[PDB]
Amino acid sequence: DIQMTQSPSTLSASVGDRVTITCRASQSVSTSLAWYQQKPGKAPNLLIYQASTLYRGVPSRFSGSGSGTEFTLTIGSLQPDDFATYYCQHYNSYSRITFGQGTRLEIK
């Protein structure tokens, strides 16, 4: 399998700031990634697929990019809602689906 590493483990930010979350691959996974948001107590939901495409119904503030093993999730202006746990998921062909540890967004 492929080990998914996302850094930082936990970073705090204030409303209106710019926060970027990366995800590191053990080896190349093409551009087949997916970012997940999990509010505590709630099942997680999809934001980005194909590592760059915004899913329908998700605000355009969320933004992802990167290729190969470097992938970053970028938040244009962090709002009080977006405080949650963020996961990066890969679905490369011939390899099994794994997730990251989960970056945490903490207020102030």
């Binding site: 399998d1 997916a34 099942a43 697929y49 998921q89 062909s93 997730f99």
Partner: protein, 121 residues
């Protein structure tokens, strides 16, 4: 707006079996592949199984090979995952999931609520 409910959880002894159900509502069940996603109490997310739209092929994560058997029955519109020979690393919340439907995109969009499965003594 597409709700997946799961049932059949509880607490069982190690090595015992248990059945899970993922009865769906208002979703076109027979035309969509479905997954099972496991979230350990350590907040880690791990994929478990996936079954094709007619159940022609089944895939499992290596950690659960030979122990978990999953199947789909389109007629009454529910999904099953039968558990055999469990152990202490299967204590987790179990999420039903639905593949988005992309040509090559295996991403989950309508997650289920989740049913807790605990094994201890």
């Amino acid at each position: 707006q597409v709700q997946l409910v799961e049932s059949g959880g509880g607490v069982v002894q190690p090595g015992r079996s248990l059945r899970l159900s993922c009865a769906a509502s208002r979703l076109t069940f027979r035309n969509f592949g479905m997954h099972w996603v496991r979230q350990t109490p350590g907040k880690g997310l791990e994929w478990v199984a996936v079954i094709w739209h007619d159940g022609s092929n089944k895939f499992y994560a290596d950690s659960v090979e030979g122990r978990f058997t999953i199947s789909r029955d389109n007629s009454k519109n529910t999904l099953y995952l039968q558990m055999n020979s469990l152990r202490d690393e299967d204590t987790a919340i179990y999420y039903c999931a639905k593949d988005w439907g992309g040509a090559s995109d295996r991403v989950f969009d309508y997650w289920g609520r989740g049913t807790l499965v605990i094994v201890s003594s």
